[PDB]
Amino acid sequence: LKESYLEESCSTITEGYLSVLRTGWYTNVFTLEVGDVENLTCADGPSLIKTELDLTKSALRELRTCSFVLGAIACGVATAAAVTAGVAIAKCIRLESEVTAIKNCLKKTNECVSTLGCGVRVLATAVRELKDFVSKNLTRAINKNKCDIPDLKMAVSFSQFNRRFLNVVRQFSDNAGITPAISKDLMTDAELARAISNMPTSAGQIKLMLENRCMVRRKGFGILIGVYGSSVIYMVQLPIFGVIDTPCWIVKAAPSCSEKKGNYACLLREDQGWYCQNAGSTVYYPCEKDCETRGDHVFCDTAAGINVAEQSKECNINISTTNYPCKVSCGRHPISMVALSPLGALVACYKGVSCSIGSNRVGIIKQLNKGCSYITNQDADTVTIDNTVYQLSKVEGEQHVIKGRPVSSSFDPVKFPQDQFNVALDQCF
């Protein structure tokens, strides 16, 4: 990893991140067959089997009753698109003809591919353990509607198999049919690994995905299709990672403030977030929740990206002279703050605040001068601002300083723009 400190703009650029970009969705329909539980009745009063059975009928009945700020512009659009796309696909799946075809498709196997009337191909998987048990056991065990049988093993068995079903219904009921994530009950580890293996991607992408099975779950979601007879039908949208290992970097910045004649000329780069090159194009991810790190890998959702011109990288090289409209924000008010980076931290220390760096072994080592200072995780273990202590990162990597005259020193002494927002570097000067 390489972190470069930019004295010119009081910002840092960290390179060497790899890209794991979600390019599509793989629709998987699951049919959890509950069986003919409706005809089971308990006439011998309260019993252990009756308690789970009544809960099961209750769960089934309950389910029948359910069926130009870049970051502010883009945040949730990918999420809304993901849900909307799933809902669009769900409406296609809701057709009785498709449910009938899928049920017929799964009549002879536990996994089959069916083409919906809307033309989308979906992978269908059958879950049969519960229907088998109940029919071949519980149903029979329940003789002449008597449920208080002495065979406690039967009751324990039933409570064990229904655990998954009750959890699935609970998650959808508590989430009003749209869950935020794929729990182990919606798709087990074995089911996920099998589903991934059938994805239309290269062997290399599949391998990367198989190693990070846990990350795949967090970006997916489940949607309840409905209740058709004795089978509960739901759909799971799995993320398709069609682009992997592409150069990504993250830009972080802190307020660059210069003080002339007691006055303050501050400047803050708002072009912060993740940027990745893809097929020579630069994709910008402005929302916090759309990119997540795992070591050198940053998982970003392509549906959250906004394509930016390649020239946007010039803002990290010569923002002062470049013709590219590097958008920043300014304000005659100084803000002292710590911006933690992967390989260090930006420490903006101005008038009125006491700033020092320290280590767990030596405590306070030295006071920091006023202005924007970059501290490597080798020079100190912790940074302290007044009484606020910030713990430094222990990631290993290379640190470089790109010297340059601060842009804030190139403000207009005659007149400084006041509290600028959603503007550009030229507007500040």
Epitope: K108, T109, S197
Partner: antibody, heavy 119, light 108 residues
């Protein structure tokens, strides 16, 4: 109902390589897989191999591992089976059948008319 | 792999006779057994799937039963067109091992 049309009988000399065709019809080929089964004269049914027409993944039994190459053209809905290092004892009827799309096993519901391969 | 043993290997019967064919799995395969009809010189025909479900277009005289490791194919009344070799197949493991087959011959 879908239909399968296999190539005609072929007679080849020992050690040659033979390529057998399997044309699918009347069904959505791209949603299934093709399994190959042979019947040696006087012997039972033996699995030869399987290919997913959706993913292209292949699996083979130990006696056919490395010897058989399977291909599935989804554009023409035609499968081909190529058997290498033919021996006189490999003279048998090779059948292509509609196998599972994926790892879940299933019965074979569509069968070709069969191809007599003579070594 | 699961070895599949059919019994008997050959059975001679007359038209209308009740025919019974057994298939044994070396380990439990639940209900994942399939049955195929293979007439000489004709392609194999699927008869039963999931141990007991009758295939579309198969005459109702054919019935399948059993579970776990032992499965049985029963023909309620053998017709002239039923004299053929029958093969059971387990649909539980990836290898889908076939049985050695049972030949149904006309009783002299």
């Amino acid at each position: 109902q879908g239909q399968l049309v296999q190539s005609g009988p072929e007679v080849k000399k020992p050690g040659a390589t033979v390529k057998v065709s399997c044309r699918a019809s009347a069904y959505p080929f791209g949603n299934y897989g093709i399994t190959w089964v042979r019947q040696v004269p006087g012997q039972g049914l033996e699995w030869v191999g399987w290919i997913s027409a959706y993913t292209g993944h292949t699996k083979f039994p130990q006696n056919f591992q490395g010897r058989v190459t399977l291909t599935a053209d989804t554009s023409t809905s035609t499968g081909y089976m190529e058997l290498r290092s033919l021996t006189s004892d490999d003279t048998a009827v090779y059948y292509c059948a509609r196998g599972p799309c994926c790892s879940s096993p299933r019965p074979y519901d569509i069968w070709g008319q069969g191809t007599m391969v003579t070594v | 792999d699961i070895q599949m043993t059919q019994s008997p290997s050959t059975l001679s019967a007359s038209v209308g006779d009740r025919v019974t064919i057994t298939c044994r799995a070396s380990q439990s395969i639940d209900d994942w057994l399939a049955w195929y009809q293979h007439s000489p010189g004709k392609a194999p025909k699927l008869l039963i799937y999931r141990a007991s479900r009758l295939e579309s277009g198969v005459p109702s005289r054919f019935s399948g039963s059993g579970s776990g490791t032992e499965f049985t194919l029963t023909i309620s009344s053998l017709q002239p067109d039923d004299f053929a070799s029958y093969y059971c197949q387990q649909c539980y493991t990836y290898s889908q091992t076939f049985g050695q087959g049972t030949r149904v011959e006309i009783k002299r």
